[PDB]
Design a protein around this ligand. Sequence first.
Ligand SMILES: [Cl-]
Ligand SMILES: [Cl-]
Length: 164
Amino acid sequence: MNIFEMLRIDEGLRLKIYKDTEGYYTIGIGHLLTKSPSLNAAKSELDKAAGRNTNGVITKDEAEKLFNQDVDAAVRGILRNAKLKPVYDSLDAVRRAALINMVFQMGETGVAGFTNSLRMLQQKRWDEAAVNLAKSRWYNQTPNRAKRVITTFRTGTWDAYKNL
Ligand SMILES: [Cl-]
Ligand SMILES: [Cl-]
């Protein structure tokens, strides 16, 4: 398993525009197009992102390309963020993947705000961080996914993903 496979499981794959868990227009593998309530706005961001008149549909290869770019950008965002980088550099490879999943879903800002949990992850207090991560809107709004990521941080293995 790896980060790509992990997020492909948590985000799914859809070739026409859809609404994510928060009602925001998205496409592909979790590629947010816009938070605006407007379908035209979304269609227009989609065209600008694909470089062509898409009419709201993309192919598989384009979804995969937006995915590659989004993962690269999540990683680079962590490395440039003063509150995230030290955490990321302290973790082993499986747990790094769990932090990139969080940044992909919620944004660097969002994550950088879990101050207390980041601190515990840095200290390697696994169970504690798990409990703390759970007290969040993130966990109450998308509990199944949040559980998979939290178990990932707690155990340092891909067990929550094996089966899927
Ligand atoms: Cl883009
Ligand atoms: Cl969920």
